[PDB]
Design a protein around this ligand. Structure first.
Ligand code: CA
Length: 321
């Protein structure tokens, strides 16, 4: 019956659902992910190890420290990107003008950008210049999309709802500001709020452009020659799983879990080998009886494999005392 769970990541279970990379470090007592310290040439990221189903809602609620320096006020950069990618789990965008989003293909997201790249970045940067409507000083926030080659474009428009905009509250002091990304699975509306300032857009076009309805989440920051302490504080991230299989190990007499249910996560179409844990159950005094795969249509009992779909699957292995 349960195929795809609605998960809430919080500071205590973060390492179970997410993985830090590069310069990123995590303090579990505070829920603070430090993506970069305020130093040269850093890059750090955290990625969510399960695909997010955009047919369902999802919500990040937490705080962000963007640093103490920005365009026109010291040499601050590069900014923090929050990316949703149709590509494989665990991938992250590039450093510099890409702001953690550029480099992913057909992706979309939001960035807090403290370094205005006024002139066109070179080809390797995977980013177009930041827009003139945010030039002239101050950090800015914006939606961002990338094309099939991973090139990032800061989103602009004639609308106050979604146009790129200089931050109402500039990062002068290393203060954590409220940050929220809220997404509605029915209306496809994504709403982003940083320090009292809001951006909102129906993202159904970017979703359709991506070729899929489920996404790999990454949060990535870098420093170049320009620097800043860049941190995200959990806070919580709530989402519904895609491309998972639940595997249960159940007492055939009672109907109770013998060991905890296991969730395998993968990319869509990935063939994943699942484990009936036979030896382990034997050690607990249990012998294999049967399997119920009726909630996993791709289940292959000969190879012990499932093929991840857009939705969830569940396989139950039964054992007897
Ligand atoms: Ca920039």
């Amino acid at each position: 019956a349960v195929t795809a769970n609605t998960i809430t990541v919080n500071k205590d279970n973060l390492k179970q659902y997410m993985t830090t990379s590069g310069n990123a470090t995590y303090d579990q007592s505070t829920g603070i992910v430090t993506l970069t310290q305020d130093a040269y040439s850093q890059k750090g990221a955290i990625t969510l190890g399960t695909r997010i189903d955009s047919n369902k809602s999802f919500h990040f609620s937490g705080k962000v420290n963007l640093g103490n320096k920005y365009e026109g006020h010291g040499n601050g950069g590069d900014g923090i990107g929050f990316a949703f990618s149709p590509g494989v789990l665990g991938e992250t965008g590039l450093n510099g003008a890409a702001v953690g989003i550029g480099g992913l293909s057909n992706a979309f997201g939001f960035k807090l950008d403290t370094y205005h790249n006024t002139s066109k970045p070179n080809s390797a940067a995977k980013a177009n210049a930041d827009p003139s409507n945010v030039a002239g000083g101050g950090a800015f926030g914006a939606f961002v999309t990338t094309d099939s080659y991973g090139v990032a474009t800061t989103y602009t428009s004639s609308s106050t709802a979604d146009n790129a905009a200089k931050l109402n509250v500039q990062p002068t002091n290393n203060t954590f500001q409220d940050f929220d990304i809220n997404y509605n699975g029915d209306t496809k509306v994504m709403t982003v709020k940083y320090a009292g300032q809001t951006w909102t857009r129906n993202i159904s076009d970017w979703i359709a452009k991506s070729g899929t309805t489920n996404f790999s989440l990454s949060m990535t920051a870098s420093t170049g020659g320009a620097t800043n302490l860049q941190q995200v504080q959990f806070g919580t991230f709530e989402y519904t799983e895609s491309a998972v299989t639940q595997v249960r190990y159940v007492d055939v007499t009672t109907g109770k879990d013998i060991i905890p249910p296991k969730t395998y996560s993968g990319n869509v179409d990935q063939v994943v080998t699942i484990d009936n844990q036979q030896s382990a159950l034997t050690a607990k005094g249990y012998n294999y009886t049967s399997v119920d795969s009726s909630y996993a249509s791709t289940y292959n009992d000969t190879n012990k494999t499932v093929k991840m779909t857009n939705a969830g699957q569940s396989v139950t292995y039964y054992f007897t005392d």
